[PDB]
Each structure stands twice: as structure tokens, then as C-alpha cells.
Paper text:
Spr1654 is involved in the early steps of TA precursor synthesis, where the first amino sugar UDP-AATGal is suggested to be synthesized by this aminotransferase, followed by several TA biosynthesis pathway steps. The three-dimensional structures revealed that Spr1654 has a fold characteristic of the type I aminotransferase family. Each Spr1654 subunit can be divided into an N-terminal arm (residues 1–14), a large PLP-binding domain comprising residues 15–276 and a smaller C-terminal domain comprising residues 277–404. Two dimers, composed of subunits AB and CD, are present in the asymmetric unit of all the obtained crystals of all forms of Spr1654, with a buried surface area of 2490 Å2 per monomer (15% of the total solvent accessible surface area).
The crystal structure of Spr1654 was determined in the apo-, PLP- and PMP-bound states at 1.9 Å, 2.2 Å and 2.4 Å resolutions, respectively. Consistent with the comparison between the apo- and ligand-bound forms of other SATs, nothing seems to happen with Spr1654 upon PLP/PMP dissociation. Indeed, the crystal structure of the apo-form of Spr1654 indicates that water molecules fill the cofactor-binding cavity, without any alteration of the conformation of any residue (data not shown). In all crystal structures, the electron density is well defined for residues Tyr4 to Thr404 within all the four subunits present in the asymmetric unit, except for a short helix comprising residues Ala238 to Leu244 that is missing due to flexibility in one subunit within each dimer (subunits B and D). This region of the protein could be part of the substrate-binding cleft, which explains its high mobility in the absence of substrate (see below).
Numbering used by the authors:
A (entry chain B): 3 to 237, 246 to 408
B (entry chain A): 6 to 404
The structure:
Amino acid sequence: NYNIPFSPPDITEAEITEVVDTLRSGWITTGPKTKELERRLSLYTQTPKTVCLNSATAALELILRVLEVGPGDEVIVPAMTYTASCSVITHVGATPVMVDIQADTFEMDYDLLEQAITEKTKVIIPVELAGIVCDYDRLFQVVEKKRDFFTASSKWQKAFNRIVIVSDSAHALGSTYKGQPSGSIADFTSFSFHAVKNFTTAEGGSATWKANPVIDDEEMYKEFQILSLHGQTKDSWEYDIVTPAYKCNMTDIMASLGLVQLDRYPSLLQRRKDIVDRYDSGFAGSRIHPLAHKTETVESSRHLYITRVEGASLEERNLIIQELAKAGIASNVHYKPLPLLTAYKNLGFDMTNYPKAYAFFENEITLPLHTKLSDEEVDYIIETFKTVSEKVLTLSKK
Amino acid sequence: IPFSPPDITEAEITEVVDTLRSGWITTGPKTKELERRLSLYTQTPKTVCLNSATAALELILRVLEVGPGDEVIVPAMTYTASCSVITHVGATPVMVDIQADTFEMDYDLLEQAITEKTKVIIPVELAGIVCDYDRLFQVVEKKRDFFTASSKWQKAFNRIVIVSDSAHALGSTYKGQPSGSIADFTSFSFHAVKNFTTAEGGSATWKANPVIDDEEMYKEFQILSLHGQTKDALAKMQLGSWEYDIVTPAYKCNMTDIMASLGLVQLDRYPSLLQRRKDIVDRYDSGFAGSRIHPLAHKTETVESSRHLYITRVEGASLEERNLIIQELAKAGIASNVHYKPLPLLTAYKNLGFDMTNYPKAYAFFENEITLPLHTKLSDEEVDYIIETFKTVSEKVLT
């Protein structure tokens, strides 16, 4: 039969050999391969420097720490995102401010974003959900429009003298917006190389920033390095510790996976395109409505096949997932809005303030999208998801 | 001669390859099996394998809910990571000076440093040598009336909790018991340069105690290490187990099966690695006997050290003379190191008000300290060369 997994890893013998090479070398933690991966990633994202770290969460947190966002500052995040986009705000002691999304897309309602901005707002964190990059022209217009609310209180906040926009591009390595690669669009960007992502090092990620005359790239790179490795500096036993910092460097074991993945990535991206186009033609005219991966402004890296089923309640969506599972099709939900989660409910966030986020979630189902899918499996998912959705609704009507 | 190259064989490589061909490249069955095997090795009920010792020590503090207004005692003579985690959770580090003839805290001064705010003591098992736990447990008991619990786990103990920094001490013993089983909680390090390596990694464990439910405690670490994510019984039993909750906005420091693969093989190899380190230490020890080079003892009445660092102090040497000796070792093709600058020498801790003049014993230990290479890629000929060169060089610098 079929037992189609949601997100198995795509590892070949080339990854294994490269990792083996590292394990024979003098360098098994951070070494030359990590530096080479950062160099190649920078060229790929059209940014001057990249800091490879052990997760996207570590990257996003370090961006916030480099910006010195902390107690008394506000950071804006969508109500519809993964917990990790928000949790790093609480880690640095800042106040998350959630903004509701639009009716026909995951993106923040940018009018409501404008309204949420205060004198305390330091950072906006858009999420490039499923690889689809946000309306950056509008986002930059908002921060410029509200520039007079901004009051810098750190080195880097003074340099930019406005709200800094930090892309959560966990899902978006290789996505483009008006022809420009994610990484080059926002002021800072985090990427994720987690086991389930398009590009994987099992655990990993990176921080980068777009070229900007107010940033010395070597100085910025060095500040991340210091925060990722205990605050340690050297001017050969002697070192100093300048701040009691963290431990989130990338190993050459992981960088080895990355280097091979990056060679493979154009082909991987192409396969995902072919699967999305097959799904898209398959769901045309049905109740199954996918998020568009190709728009006038965006070419998505096609990380998640996010769908919403027209007319389906919460209960009905949950039943459909369990029926897909009985048919040998794994599926997922991206995402529970943050206010549904105990941690954020406990911080006073209330789901009734973000009805659009709720309505997106309510009928959302993510189908498998990865490079181990055969065409036959995709065809099977298309036909099954239609038959199952119809069955559940015809059952409800009855 | 390098200071600390990794000792990786084809068995590690094959095990990692096996993982890379499996469905599981991040946290998976190999990580759970490594935790199980490590728990048996350390004689503890459960182990939580994570991405660094620093992660493990932090999480212990976060499980204990040590935070703002609490004090955590650490030695003045330790690595920055023993202390930095205290600041991470927002607690106040309290440093204690060490003894004249060992790295260990002066336990009288430890008693004096205890207040109503003290929640945790972090001894460091320097070079693999385990601290005087009988004395440490006597101190916390003696001062029990200073303690006022302010969290679930603090109430359970109802005293200062003793957390071992065993970064250097996987496989060490104290009165025949393995590090891991001695302190209330223990962190271990599997960093590239440690006796047992996963390139980056570490663990948290805890000794058996009736007031701890081991599965509940294990589950709390898991949750903190992986975003605060939980799933209920109903969600796990369903064929489609997507639904989760986030209970606290937690952290991201889980161990991958890639790293656990290295660990499993290292753990099979570990008795033999430990034996080789013993043989090197004994050779150094006989070599330095009667000289000015005084090594820390790896075998005592109470301790059998895992023999992670060969820490030495050169009698009669000033700061400047020590530094010259290191550079002369380096010209002779011998890498060496210093463990450690006392914390008050470091800008970060200076900046928090810590003053080197308060910890003269820590300074004096550091001043004439040289660490010689101790790892399993050393040949006997290299060890003999280091012995005879270090003696000649020291004599030359002093003459």
C-alpha cells in the first residue's frame, strides 16, 4: 500500500562521504568547512557574510541580542507562526506584540501592523511561511512611515534609526521576492537547516544581513561569533571572555551536510516545483485551496504545501487529517495561532483578538512536500484528499 | 605534538553513516539508546543528552527555577561556562576562593559565602578529579536553616542543591561511585576536546532520590530542550499525531542521532581510552617525580580520575616565567595550555564587580600552572619527549 511520510530526510552517499571526510580530519566541531559553508551561503543569498549556527532559533535570538533588544522593547510577530519566531523575544526579555493576519493569506494585515507600532517597537519579524516571502515593499513603507515613533537605545539601533525588519526565513532558503533571494531583502534574516527543512544539516541554521552602508560586515560577523562561543576573544593560551555569552556554533559535521546539500539544492528546488505544479493542477476547481507558490512578486522555495479546505470546521478538518492517515498519508497543520498555546495564553494573549489567524488555522491542512515523494504518491494524495474531504462533508451534511 | 586532537576511528564513521541512511538524523532512537547506556554507566536512573554541557548546566538551573534574586556559588578557579549560565537565568554568581594545594573550593570559605538566597553550589571536577562530596553535603546540611524554597524542586530538596560540573569527569569515581551518581545533578561535556566526544554535546543527569519522579524530571528537561513542546496521550495514540501544545517558550538544545552515533561507539571504546590515559598519566607521574614539576594527583584515597587534563604547577615560577616556559615548550613542538585564568581576571566578570584580590589562592594556582597534552593519540615516545623537554625548559628559564 502507501505509507507516505510528511518530511523524511533526503540524504545521499555524497553527504555521507563529506561527513566521513570531516570525521577523519583534525576538525570535528567548528572548522574550515563551516567557514566555507558561510562563504557559499552568502553568495547564494547575495549577502556579504553569513554566520552558521546550530539552529534558526539560535540565529534569531542572536540577531535580537546583537540589536540589544531587551526589557521594555516591543517586537512584533504574526499571530500565525511557529512558536520559535516568538519565544526568542521572551528569551531576551522583550515584549512580544502579535498582529492578526489577512483573510486570504498568512501575511500580517499591514494596516493592523501600523496600528500595533509604538515608541517601544524595535523589530518586526515577518515569517516567510512555506517559502512564500512577505510584501517587503509594504513592510519597509510601514517602518519608514512610523520612523518618528522610533527612539534608538543601542549602537545598532542608532545605525538603522528605525524599526529593524528581521526575516524568519526558516522555510525560505532559496525563495525570491522581485527576483532577489531571501537573505537580501530584510535587514537581518534567519534560516533553518533542521532535519525537516528543504536544506538540512539535521540541526542547524544561519544568520545573515543585507548589505548596508551603516554595517561594517566584518565587525558584525565578529559580534555574532563572540556571542555564539562563550564571549571568548583573543588578540597562544591566552583569551578573554568579554560577556558571559552562549554556545551555539555549527560543527564541521553539520557544515559537511550543508556543503553537499547546497550543491544539490538547485535540483531539489526543481523537484519541489514539479510536485507543487502537479498538486496545483490536481486541486484546481476543487474545495482544496493551496497557498500560491508562484506569484507576480514571489518564487517560493516550496517548503510546505499549505492548503485550506473551503467550508470545513475545526472538527471536520481534524477528521480529514485522521482519514488521510488511515489512507497512508501523513499530514500536518501550520499552525495553531500562538494565542492557542498555553505559553502565550499564560502571557495574556487571547485568541479572540486574532480571528483571521484562527480562521486560517481552522481549515488548514499541510500535505507532504519533499523530494522523496514519487509522482504516483502525489497522484494518490491528490485523489485521496479530494475523496476524503467530500466524504467528511457529505457525512456532516447528513 | 597537539594538545587535544580527536580520536575518531572507522567505527564512529560507520555508525554515523548508518544514522545518515536512516529515517532519523536529528533526535531519534540512537539518542534514547545513548541516554540509556550512559545512565547505566553513571549509575543514575535517567540521562538527558543535549548539544553541550553548557546547555545541560543551564537546563538544570532552569528546572530548579533558579533566577533573579537567587545566589549560585561557583569556584573562582573554573571555566567561564560554569558561571555564565548563572547570569543566563538571571541569578547572582557568588565566587569562592580555592585551597592552597588543590583546585577545590576552600569549604570553610564556602560555608561563609552561603546566605538565605543561596540555591545551588556548582563544584567543578577539574581535570577529572572529583571534589570532596562528603564535605560539600555536610556544608549544605549544616546551613539548611538558611534555605527557603521558592519552586517545586527547591521545596523537594529543601536545602541547597549541589550540581556537579563534570565536563572533565565522565568515568571518574569518588569512593568507588561514578560521577553522575554523587551530586544532586550532574552535567557532562562531549565537546571535541573531551575524553568522550560527540564533537559537540553533553548531558544532564541526577542521582536517584526518592523525592524525584525520574520520568517526570526527564520529561521536564525534554520540554525545555525542544521549544516547550508537549503532546498528550490522545494526540500520541492517534494515527495522525500532529497536535501539540507549547507550555513555556523554551529552548533548542537537543542532541541529534548523528552526535549520538559518535557517542555510542565512544562509549564502547571508553574503558580502553580510559586505560590508555591512565598509562600516560603514570608515565608522566614517574617522569616528573622529584622535579619542580608538580602534577595534580589523578589517583587519591577517594578519587580515581578519568584523567582528562594533565594539570601541573611549576614550583617557584612567576607569572612571567610560566608564560616564557609555555613559549619555550611551543618552540620545542609541544602544545600546552592553562586551566585556568580565575574568573575575576576575565572582563565579563570584572564588569560584574568581581575582583582578583579577593581570591588569592585562585590566582596562585593559575600563576604557575601549565597543562601538558593528555589524549589518546600521544605515543609513549612523545610523552618521554614532553617529560624531558619540560624539565630542561623549566630549568633553563629559572637559571
